[PDB]
Design a protein around this ligand. Structure first.
Ligand SMILES: *[C@H](CS(=O)(=O)c1ccccc1)[C@H](CCc1ccccc1)NC(=O)[C@H](Cc1ccccc1)NC(=O)N1CCN(C)CC1
Length: 221
């Protein structure tokens, strides 16, 4: 595998979005992964509708602004037979009634693939050969809220108790040593003003730091 990967450089990633005052992180992680996979198959990067996921995936177990799972979002897309674009189904950061319109569907999946739980080597393989991967992490510490640059490392992070869904768009390392200061390049959904232009580097190969590889998955297009 390459020593460094950054799918943003290949056009697989849309601009950083902002979930605002709604616990829809899972929806942004899901659309991010689907945007990358749809790009692989069509060569077109189209911003997808998180609102569509928020309003419509309750039957699959999601609770809109009150939390959800990327896996169940992918299941919704499969069962629903499609997902609308952001332009046609705008984000309003509140739970509303499903308004999915088939004519505006621009993405689909037939299910999803789960990365071996807790295996950072497996996650690395997926990121390198598949594209952006949806992941869950423990981002509940104040250190994460205040992240600005460098490699994020929180001694109190849990690899089991996760509370935030984000997107791994690559990996690499700082300094000159390819085997040191390694990190996962993560796209957050708190706007471009947060962290490093909306992104955060999470310590990689540091015993599955913050559970980055505990619940990773990607939609099958
Ligand atoms: C997104 C995380 S966030 O809101 O940006 C946030 C903010 C500050 C610190 C950490 C995280 C949401 C928030 C959900 C929430 C809303 C309101 C009150 C409490 C919580 N979190 C999720 O949706 C997580 C994502 C996830 C995916 C996979 C594995 C582990 C976590 N899921 C979630 O919280 N769920 C799952 C579904 N269930 C019905 C409700 C709770």
């Amino acid at each position: 595998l390459p020593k460094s990967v950054d799918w943003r450089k290949k056009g697989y990633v849309t601009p950083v979005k902002n979930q605002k005052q709604c616990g829809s992180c899972w929806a942004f992680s899901a659309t991010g992964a689907l945007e990358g996979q749809m790009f692989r198959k069509t060569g077109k990067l189209v911003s997808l509708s998180e609102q569509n996921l928020v309003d419509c995936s309750r039957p699959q177990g999601n609770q809109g602004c009150n939390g959800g799972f990327m896996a169940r979002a992918f299941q919704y897309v499969k069962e629903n037979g499609g997902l609308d674009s952001e332009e046609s189904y705008p984000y309003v950061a509140v739970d509303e009634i499903c308004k999915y319109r088939p004519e505006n569907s621009v993405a689909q999946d037939t299910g999803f693939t789960v990365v071996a739980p807790g295996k950072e080597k497996a996650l690395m393989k997926a990121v390198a050969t598949v594209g952006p991967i949806s992941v869950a992490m423990d981002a509940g510490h104040s250190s994460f809220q205040f992240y600005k640059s460098g490699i994020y490392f929180e001694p109190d992070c849990s690899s089991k108790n996760l509370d935030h869904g984000v997107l791994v768009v690559g990996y690499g390392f700082e300094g000159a040593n390819s085997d040191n200061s390694k990190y996962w390049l993560v796209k957050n959904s708190w706007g471009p003003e947060w962290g490093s232009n909306g992104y955060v580097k999470i310590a990689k190969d540091k015993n599955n730091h913050c559970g980055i590889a505990t619940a990773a998955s990607y939609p099958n297009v």
